[PDB]
Design a binder for this molecule. Structure first.
Ligand SMILES: CCCCCCCC/C=C\CCCCCCCC(=O)O[C@@H](COC(=O)CCCCCCC/C=C/CCCCCCCC)COP(=O)(O)OCC\N=C/C=C(C)\C=C\C=C(C)/C=C\C1=C(C)CCCC1(C)C
Ligand SMILES: *[C@@H]1O[C@H](CO)[C@@H](O)[C@H](O)[C@H]1NC(C)=O
Ligand SMILES: *[C@@H]1O[C@H](CO)[C@@H](O)[C@H](O)[C@H]1NC(C)=O
Ligand SMILES: *[C@@H]1O[C@H](CO)[C@@H](O)[C@H](O)[C@H]1NC(C)=O
Ligand SMILES: *[C@@H]1O[C@H](CO)[C@@H](O)[C@H](O)[C@H]1NC(C)=O
Ligand SMILES: [Mg+2]
Length: 1911
């Protein structure tokens, strides 16, 4: 039966290709969402970074110098691709390439390790010291061997020349002594100088300056000269070394009046001066996960900076310090860094107990601050040592002696021993003592001397002293309890002088001795510490989480530093021993990650968008199927011979074709839009095609539930969207499913699509992206769901949906034969001419018809020559065809020629045969001229003509019909008669209807036998004889009637009514009547024969109220009506009482499930806050006993942390058992790889291949090697696995095994256990200076003894504790604490672990380390008002979403009202009420009143729901009336707002969906815009915001309600905030500033919209007039003009009798033309027996409680009177409509189409009621399209029944074996075709022929049917 598929598919394609709006939308709308996705993809570029190795971070326990150097160097936390030096096992110092370190290295290499130069330098040192000692006069304490007491010796004073001299024989004093005395003296004399005795310059003899030291021998030799010129080559090599040259080249801008960049270039110089990091100084990685901190300001671009503090005058600092603070805070450039650094530099630390134990702990922790104070004192000592240096370089006596030695004749070696050694001798005179005391002029000092550098060094020292004085080093303030703290801390945070509060619990103010286990809490500001309510990063981000400022609050906030200080103080308090070990937190290395945030969107937006891509489409598909079912058109196909599965097969082919085109376009769009980079387009195409197939099965399944096309189209999209939501619910609980409950949930197609696209996103994060070889593999490596199973089970869902849809369609059809069980006498009449079976409906005629249809199986009878339809179902289905039912069976959009082709090819035939048949159109249907016209374009007569002609498209021998012309136009009835007669073809045509006139002329070979038992055969000749009436204002015809009655032996007004033919008597009466016609007033004459309808009948105060008594009664009636309509209807109950209730309940669930945003409790800060993890251990320096015992007390005895304390640490964390050491088993080829190949230290293991710029992977693909040879494991007693990373490359192992660890964890990427958060490397020795302090003090004292600089109080105070300063400057023994920053509280917890290990290692022999420990707790202080503002913003955003949901829920009830109103308006029920006498004002007022009542009930229910939650924001006593007012007034204002939607729209379900969408859109926009634009505190949009709030959006009641709820939430939040702070709040609604504005706006807007709605609203007494003068003219327009439906004045002048106006009755408009029953059932279809009550209580007018008395209106039908109006059939419905139309006894009765399809008996009852009414004296005017009903019901008035026939061209019709007909024809021709019946069209000859009947029958005049103005 493939031809059926082909034909139905062609039909479906032809209908689909003509809509031209669904076609384009179904292809464009899905593309728009993915264009949005493309834009999002372009707006979210991926962030890729290389391998990250981070520099070591020192701690205060490691000494001031490493700690500060780390602080300065690692301000950016740089990423180095190569491992840092600190990551090596034995070394910790990354400052190896710094210029200072290299200069120090060269200093040791050349000077310290010189060739025994130390000995020579020392010898020179004691040489100078001995010379200085000899320089001292020491009064007379001299050896007296030589006259050298004092004053440059006294040789002249004491010698042999004293007194008279002459001791040496002939000694003379300046008298040219012949003999010179030399025995008593160590060394031509005359008065004149330069003589023979004065030949020597100074002293020729005794040139040695030693002079045996003048005491105890020890003469100073030339050892100083020997050392001289030996230091010169080494000094030159040191100076010319590249390190020293680099030092000079970088230091030139420094220490000068330069600094071109005040801070940018200074940092650049200081970096390579102190840090010297490789690469370009490293690079920082940026943390983009702003949503993890709830930092909405960062996303929106708001500044998010706290308010600046006040100047606070000067405080206790210096003027320079205050100026610096004010400049730093005021400068916008440097206020952020200064804000971060101020608590550290100048802040206070507060401790609560104030106990002797606490004071001891803090004194021990003070070490860093004593060290800083010592540095400050050392710098301050310059103030009193600098002038001494300057004076020493002034005269003094040492510098003068040096100058004299240089000033000696030739200065011994004038050119120096090291001649030409780049050093001039004048450098000892100038540039060292230039110009003596002072320079002669500016720049005359050779520009470089002692003072030239003295100013620069003095200025630098004084400036650094000034800067250092701006520091607070007495940071510890003692309080009494934690209540006094957090109050001082609040003020300090206000002025930014608070570091932390170190509160010690479990210890009283009098506690002196420390407990073995010490707990303490560090209380920080929440802005400088990680939040304690969250420990992980939620959504796992590919990245190291290593932004220096964004996610290192523990470092730069001072938490880690203070924790280290406090724990070190506790350690020193407990152990009472010197075991100095530092801490070197070192972040774990990270591999080549790729951060693609767009995947998040792709993980959430891709499914929903796809669903939203089909919503409209799915609706249309359903709108097709139900449209084939509601139009009784699927049953037409089933009668035609479809299989009930070929139709759905073709529906699939059509829908699948359109969806396949759409999916092809979407796949091309996605691939070329770079939404998916690394995916094969074919698998994505197949995934989308499987989703499409599941969607089409959803369409088929949903089409069975519904029976109305419009409702199905409106609601199918709603079900389709709703079905996806379970996926959203399951995504939050993704870990809950165990691949079995997930399967159960995924029976829904959207949920399975969501799972599949989740797997797609997971594969797209990698470089694979759903290839053919990985669809069946789950990337999580632990889930059995996979992705291929997703597509397969979506196909399974499609099959299940289709099967269940087929089952339901078979079992629950619309109206047809249904197999409820779970399956999965009689003869033939004449066979020629147009036979007609006439009978009452339901009396067996329909049963005989159905038996003849073939539907009911034939029993003991033959439908045709085939024997039986039961015996031969295939036969008599092609010939016995053309089944024309009462329903018009056509297509909405298909063409007439297309109908002909489709129906000709459906019943056999072929395309050529169908085309040939369509060519023979047999005229009609506009011939071939109207071929291109669509079926809907054709008029009703044309539509029915085509429907009947469709029966003759195929060659059909038997064409049985059912009312071909039941309600067709009279001209159209003639046309259909001509078409049907022209297609007789000798066929057994059978037609059945209640219209006998249709069988009068076109009916031949009549057989009215369907009477239930075939009582009468009813052949036309036989039916004729089962008498004739005579037709002819004078009023005297009563006497004339007797004459005619006597001549030929039912009278009414304006007319005359009165075998065995009696020709002689009849002809005599006819001649007498014709002769007397002139005398009488009759204009014409006629003859009436026996009607065919009668043949079938053979078997069968004032009562009226006036004035104000109306309106009140009016409203009651209307109220009552709607009351009934809201009791019978249950849809109006679910759409008004529960739907808002359920949505509000869901919204409140959402509100209460969200956790509070500002809890921040105390966190115990231990590594086991993360459950299962690997912690690693490295042992370096095994020789040290201290490190061995530290490893012992770290590994097994107490273990890590404090979980094992021998006395119970935490009940929630018990201690288990420790497994023995075990190296994990490894694959054989891994060992082969590691043994066969060569691996060096630089390349110890295979390298992970990360992103290659063309295949970007989230993490590198690590080969089988990775770290390699897994380390031994222990499964520590703390239920955590310890790895032994001893003698192994820790950095390589970590960075290459991290991906393997994290692949297992990231099964969901929502709460990941990285299984590795920290580790300990016990080792790393920092080289220290060998000065040892005391030697330095001795050297400085000796130097100060050489020249009397001495010192003062400051120098002595500085020198008191130099050895302690040197000891605390740096720490030699150290331990590294590796931490993973992706765990937030990781580094602090492992500081705690390391300090516990250090404390346990230092314990004495006794006092077992099991019990000792330290516990750190992070408990942030109470939030400030600025932070509480953000918390309030978050909470009120949740409340705003709740308010939006409340608006959306409450908008349903007014929508239900609008659907009621539109349903009442469309079916003209509202117009009927207006016609009866309901004024528009009264109608709208009572509708508004009832709507307010219903909404009040619904809002009371919603208020009950709210109060059931005890929400303080809304349900508090001061807010409950507010919430009630908001709800009630919102409804009361929004109901009139959408009243006009009744006029705008015409379809109820469409109105519901459109109004719900509009309300949701308006509500979300109104709430969100005002809630978001108010967040921008400092902007120019605020005015814009106000232009949105006060004026723009206040018009919408949605905005009023939403802003009211939001403002209530904000007011309650701020009231709670002030109550927490104790300031209290007014909290008074109805103030016009909080909520009163919205209430007044609602009050005004309700009235305004109600007025807008009211503005939108803007014949003789006894003769029936048949208003059918022109059929083509719009009589419906005339009736509307006579009624209130149309106000067009372009019409004829008419009056209602009582009043005359433009609208006839416009002058009065009261109780005029009361009935207006048109060709429409103006029934509410929900009220029973109340129509006669509603249409009488006051609606026509109040009849004074006479409702029961006026029960006569129930004469037509009393059995169905008490049943629902929609419950019973159309005949009873229209009988009730007519009864309520003429219920008020009006003078004028309007009737349109007086009787539609109804039983002839009921039609007779209606006609007798009408004629009785018109005889009573009530005027009736009637119109009809059948026009057969006008006869015998309407009076002489017509648009004269006999007069019209006579005036128009017409005449009487005369009707009379085979040879016997010849005499009749010959006789008939004498006076003036079919077998046994002659139809001759034709007065004197007629009378004569009647008398001559024997020589040769019934004769009737022209009827109203014949010649109905054909023109
Ligand atoms: C104009 C654009 C130009 C620039 C281009 C950028 C455009 C691209 C758009 C984004 C580029 C980057 C992609 C990041 C977002 C894209 C992800 C997406 O699209 O879907 C999300 C929707 O999730 C939700 O919104 C609530 C569910 C959270 C459940 C947590 C449970 C407990 C927490 C409850 C607190 C909830 C507060 C109440 C929320 C009220 C509703 C807003 C599914 O999150 P996920 O878990 O699947 O992924 C992990 C992400 N982690 C947290 C996600 C968010 C959004 C945190 C927002 C945090 C906030 C404060 C959101 C909104 C804000 C609040 C409420 C008040 C201030 C105003 C503001 C609107 C800014
Ligand atoms: C400083 O030296 C000068 C130079 O001779 C000399 O007057 C004296 O030693 C000092 N000057 C004083 C003390 O004014
Ligand atoms: C090593 O052996 C394992 C399992 O025996 C296998 O999966 C892997 O592919 C092998 N590798 C090589 C290089 O043979
Ligand atoms: C050093 O001693 C000299 C004399 O020997 C004296 O003039 C000078 O003031 C001293 N310097 C001091 C005490 O700083
Ligand atoms: C901090 O908040 C707690 C929470 O209950 C409160 O008890 C305490 O008094 C607050 N301290 C202040 C506001 O100083
Ligand atoms: Mg972050």
């Amino acid at each position: 039966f493939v031809r059926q598929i082909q034909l139905l598919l062609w039909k479906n394609w032809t209908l689909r290709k003509r809509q031209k709006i669904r076609f384009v939308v179904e292809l464009v709308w899905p593309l728009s969402l993915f264009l949005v996705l493309i834009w999002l993809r372009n707006a979210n570029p991926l962030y890729s970074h290389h391998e990250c190795h981070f520099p070591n971070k020192a701690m205060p326990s490691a000494g001031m110098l490493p700690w500060l150097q780390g602080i300065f160097c690692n301000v950016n936390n740089p990423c180095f691709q190569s491992p840092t030096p600190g990551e090596s096992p034995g070394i910790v110092s990354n400052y190896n390439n710094s210029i200072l370190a290299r200069v120090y290295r060269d200093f040791q290499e050349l000077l310290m390790n010189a060739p025994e130069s130390q000995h020579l330098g020392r010898i020179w040192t004691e040489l100078h010291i001995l010379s200085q000692f000899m320089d001292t006069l020491r009064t007379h304490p001299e050896r007296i061997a030589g006259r050298g007491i004092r004053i440059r010796d006294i040789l002249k004073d004491e010698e042999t020349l004293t007194l008279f001299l002459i001791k040496n024989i002939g000694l003379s004093d300046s008298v040219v002594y012949l003999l010179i005395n030399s025995q008593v003296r160590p060394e031509l004399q005359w008065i004149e100088d330069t003589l023979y005795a004065n030949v020597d310059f100074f002293k020729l003899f005794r040139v040695l300056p030693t002079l045996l030291d003048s005491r105890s021998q020890g003469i100073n030799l030339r050892s100083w000269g020997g050392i001289l010129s030996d230091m010169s080559p080494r000094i030159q090599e040191f100076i010319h070394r590249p390190s020293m040259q680099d030092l000079l080249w970088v230091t030139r801008p420094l220490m000068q009046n330069g600094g071109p960049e005040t801070f940018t270039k200074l940092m650049g110089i200081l970096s390579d001066l102190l840090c010297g990091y490789p690469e370009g100084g490293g690079s920082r990685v940026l943390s983009f996960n702003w949503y993890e901190d709830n930092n909405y300001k960062a996303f929106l671009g708001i500044d998010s900076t706290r308010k600046d503090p006040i100047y606070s005058y000067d405080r206790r600092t210096t003027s320079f310090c205050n100026a610096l603070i004010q400049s730093l805070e005021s400068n916008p450039l440097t206020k952020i860094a200064w804000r971060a650094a101020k608590p550290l530099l100048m802040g206070k630390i507060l401790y609560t107990p104030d106990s002797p134990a606490a004071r001891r702990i803090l004194k021990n922790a003070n070490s860093t601050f004593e060290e800083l104070e010592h540095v400050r004192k050392l710098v301050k000592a310059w103030e009193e040592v600098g002038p001494q240096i300057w004076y020493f370089f002034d005269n003094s006596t040492q510098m003068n002696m040096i100058r004299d030695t240089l000033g000696n004749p030739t200065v011994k070696d004038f050119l120096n021993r090291q001649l030409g050694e780049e050093g001039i001798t004048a450098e000892a005179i100038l540039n060292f003592l230039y110009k003596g005391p002072r320079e002669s002029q500016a720049d005359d000092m050779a520009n470089f001397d002692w003072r030239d550098i003295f100013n620069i060094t003095d200025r630098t020292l004084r400036l650094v002293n000034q800067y250092l004085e701006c520091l607070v080093l007495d940071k510890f303030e003692s309080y009494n309890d934690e209540t006094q703290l957090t109050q001082r801390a609040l003020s300090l945070l206000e002025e930014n002088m608070f570091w932390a509060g170190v509160v010690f619990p479990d210890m009283y103010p009098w506690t002196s001795s420390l407990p073995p286990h010490v707990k303490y809490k560090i209380r920080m500001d929440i802005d400088v510490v990680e939040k304690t309510n969250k420990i992980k990063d939620r959504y796992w981000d590919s990245g190291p989480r290593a932004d220096p400022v964004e996610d290192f609050r523990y470092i730069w906030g001072g938490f880690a530093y203070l924790q280290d200080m406090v724990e070190q103080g506790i350690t020193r308090s407990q152990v009472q021993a010197e075991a100095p070990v530092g801490i070197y937190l070192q972040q774990m290395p990270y591999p080549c990650f790729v951060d693609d945030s767009f995947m998040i969107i792709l993980n959430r937006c891709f499914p929903i968008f796809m669903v939203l891509a089909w919503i409209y489409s799915v609706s249309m598909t359903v709108k097709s199927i139900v449209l084939e079912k509601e139009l009784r058109l699927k049953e037409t196909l089933k009668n035609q011979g479809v299989s009930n599965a070929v139709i759905w097969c073709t529906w699939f082919l059509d829908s699948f074709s359109i969806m396949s085109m759409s999916i092809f376009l979407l796949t091309i769009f996605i691939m070329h839009g770079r939404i998916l980079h690394y995916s094969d387009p074919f698998i994505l195409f197949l995934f989308l095609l499987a989703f499409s197939t599941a969607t089409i099965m959803l369409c088929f399944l949903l089409s069975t539930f519904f029976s109305k096309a419009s409702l199905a189209a409106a609601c199918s999209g709603v079900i389709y969207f709703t079905l996806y939501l379970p996926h959203i619910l399951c995504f939050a609980w993704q870990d809950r499913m165990t691949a079995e409950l997930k399967k159960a949930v995924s029976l829904l197609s959207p949920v399975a699509f969501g799972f599949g696209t989740e797997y797609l996103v997971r594969f797209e994060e990698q470089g694979l992206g759903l290839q053919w070889s990985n669809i069946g593999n789950s990337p999580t490596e632990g889930d059995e769901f996979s992705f291929l199973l997703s597509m397969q089970m979506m196909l399974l869902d499609a099959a299940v949906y289709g099967l269940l849809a087929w089952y339901l369609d078979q079992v629950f059809p619309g109206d047809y034969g249904t197999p409820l069980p779970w399956y999965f006498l009689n003869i033939t009449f004449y066979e020629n001419q147009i036979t007609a079976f006439l009978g009452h409906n339901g009396a067996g005629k329909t049963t005989t018809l159905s038996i003849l249809t073939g539907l009911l199986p034939p029993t003991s009878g033959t439908v045709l020559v085939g024997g039986r339809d039961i015996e031969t179902s295939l036969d008599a289905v092609r010939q016995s065809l053309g089944m024309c039912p009462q329903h018009n069976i056509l297509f909405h959009h298909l063409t007439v020629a297309e109908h002909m082709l489709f129906y000709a090819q459906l019943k056999g035939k072929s395309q050529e045969e169908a085309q040939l048949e369509m060519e023979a159109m047999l005229e009609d249907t506009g011939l071939h001229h109207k071929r291109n016209e669509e079926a809907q374009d054709l008029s009703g007569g044309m539509q029915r003509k085509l429907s009947v002609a469709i029966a003759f498209v195929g060659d059909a021998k038997v064409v049985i019909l059912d009312e071909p012309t039941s309600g067709v136009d009279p001209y159209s009835r003639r046309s259909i008669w001509d078409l049907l007669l022209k297609y007789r073809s000798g066929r057994t045509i059978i037609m059945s209807t209640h219209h006998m006139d249709e069988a009068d002329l076109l009916g031949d070979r009549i057989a009215i036998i369907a009477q239930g038992r075939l009582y009468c055969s009813g052949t036309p000749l036989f039916l004729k004889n089962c008498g004739l009436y005579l037709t002819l204002l004078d009023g005297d015809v009563n006497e004339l009637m007797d004459v005619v009655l006597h001549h030929v032996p039912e009278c009414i007004g304006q007319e005359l009514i009165f075998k065995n033919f009696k020709h002689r008597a009849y002809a005599s009466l006819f001649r007498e009547l014709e002769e007397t016609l002139a005398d009488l007033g009759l204009s014409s004459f006629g003859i009436s024969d026996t009607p065919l309808e009668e043949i079938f009948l053979k078997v069968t105060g004032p009562q009226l109220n006036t004035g104000t008594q109306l309106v009140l009664q009016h409203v009651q009636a209307l109220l009552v009506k709607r009351f009934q309509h809201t009791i019978r209807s249950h849809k109006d109950f679910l759409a008004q009482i529960v739907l808002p209730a359920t949505f509000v309940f869901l919204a409140l669930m959402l509100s209460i499930v969200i956790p509070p945003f500002g809890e921040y409790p105390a966190l115990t800060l231990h590594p086991w806050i993360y459950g299962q993890q690997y912690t690693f251990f490295s042992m370096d320096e095994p020789g040290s006993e201290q490190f061995t015992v530290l490893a012992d007390v770290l590994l097994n005895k107490p273990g890590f942390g404090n979980r094992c304390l021998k006395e119970g640490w935490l009940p929630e964390y018990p201690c288990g058992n420790s497994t023995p050491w075990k190296t994990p088993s490894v694959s054989p080829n891994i060992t082969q790889l590691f043994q066969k190949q060569k691996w060096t230290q630089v390349n110890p293991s295979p390298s992970c291949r990360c992103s290659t710029r063309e295949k970007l992977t989230m993490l590198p693909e690590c080969p089988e090697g990775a770290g390699g040879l897994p380390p031994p494991q222990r499964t520590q007693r703390s239920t955590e696995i310890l790895q032994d990373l001893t003698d192994r490359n820790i950095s390589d192992f970590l960075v290459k095994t991290y991906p393997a660890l994290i692949r297992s964890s990231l099964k969901s990427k929502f709460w990941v256990n990285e299984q590795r958060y920290g580790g300990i490397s016990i080792g790393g020795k920092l080289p220290v200076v060998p000065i040892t302090g005391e030697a330095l003090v001795g050297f400085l004292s000796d130097l100060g003894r050489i020249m009397n600089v001495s010192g003062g109080p400051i120098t002595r105070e500085a020198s008191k504790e130099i050895p302690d300063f040197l000891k605390h400057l740096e720490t030699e023994d150290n331990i590294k604490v590796w931490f993973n920053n992706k765990g937030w509280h990781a580094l602090v917890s492992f500081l705690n672990v390391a300090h516990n290990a250090i404390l346990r290692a230092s314990l004495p022999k006794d006092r077992s380390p099991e019990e000792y420990g330290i516990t750190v707790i992070s408990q942030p202080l109470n939030l400030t008002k600025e932070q509480l503002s953000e918390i309030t913003v978050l909470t009120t955003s949740v409340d705003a979403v709740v308010a939006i949901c409340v608006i959306f829920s409450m908008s349903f009830v007014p929508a239900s009202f609008v659907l009621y109103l539109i349903q009442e308006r469309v079916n003209k029920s509202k117009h009927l009420q207006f016609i009866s006498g309901v004024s528009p004002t009264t109608y709208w007022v009572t509708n508004f009143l009832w709507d307010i009542m219903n909404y009040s009930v619904s809002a009371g229910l919603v208020v009950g729901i709210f109060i059931g939650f005890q929400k303080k924001a809304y349900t508090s006593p001061e807010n409950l009336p507010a919430l009630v007012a908001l709800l009630l007034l919102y409804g009361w204002a929004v109901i009139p707002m959408m009243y006009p939607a009744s006029f705008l729209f015409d379809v109820p379900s469409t109105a519901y969906v459109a109004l719900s969408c509009a309300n949701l859109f308006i509500g979300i926009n109104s709430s969100a815009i005002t809630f978001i634009l108010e967040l921008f505190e400092n902007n120019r949009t605020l005015l814009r915001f106000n232009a949105v709030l006060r004026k723009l959006l206040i018009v919408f009641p949605h905005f009023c309600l939403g802003r009211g709820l939001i403002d209530l939430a904000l007011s309650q939040a701020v009231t709670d905030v002030y109550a927490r702070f104790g300031e209290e709040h007014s909290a008074n609604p109805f103030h016009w500033d909080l909520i009163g504005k919205n209430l007044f706006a609602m009050v005004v807007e309700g009235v305004v919209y109600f007025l807008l709605t009211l503005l939108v609203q803007r014949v003789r007494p006894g003769e029936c007039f048949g208003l059918l003068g022109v059929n083509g003219a719009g009589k419906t327009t005339t009736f509307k003009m006579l009624t209130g439906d149309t106000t067009v004045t372009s019409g004829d002048a008419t009056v209602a009798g009582k009043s005359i106006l433009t609208n006839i009755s416009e002058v009065h408009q009261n109780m005029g033309y009361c009935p207006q029953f048109d060709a429409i059932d103006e029934l509410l279809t929900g009220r029973e027996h109340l129509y006669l009550y509603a249409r009488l209580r006051g609606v026509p007018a109040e009849e004074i409680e006479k409702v029961a008395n006026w029960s006569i209106k129930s004469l037509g039908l009393t059995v169905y009177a008490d049943c629902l109006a929609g419950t019973y059939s159309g005949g009873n419905k229209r009988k009730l409509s007519t009864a309520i139309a003429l219920i008020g006894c009006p003078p004028l009765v309007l009737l349109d189409e007086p009787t539609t399809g109804m039983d002839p008996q009921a039609r007779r009852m209606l006609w007798n009621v009408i004629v009785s009414i018109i005889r009573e004296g009530r005027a009736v005017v009637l119109t009809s399209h059948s026009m057969e009903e006008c006869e015998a019901l309407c009076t002489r008035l017509a648009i004269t029944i006999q007069h019209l026939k006579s005036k128009f061209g017409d005449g009487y019709i005369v009707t009379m074996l085979l040879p016997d007909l010849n005499p009749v024809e010959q006789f008939f021709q004498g006076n003036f075709r079919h077998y046994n019946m002659l139809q001759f069209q034709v007065a004197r000859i007629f009378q004569l022929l009647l008398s001559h009947k024997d020589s040769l029958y019934s004769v009737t005049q022209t009827t109203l049917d014949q010649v109905f103005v054909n023109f």
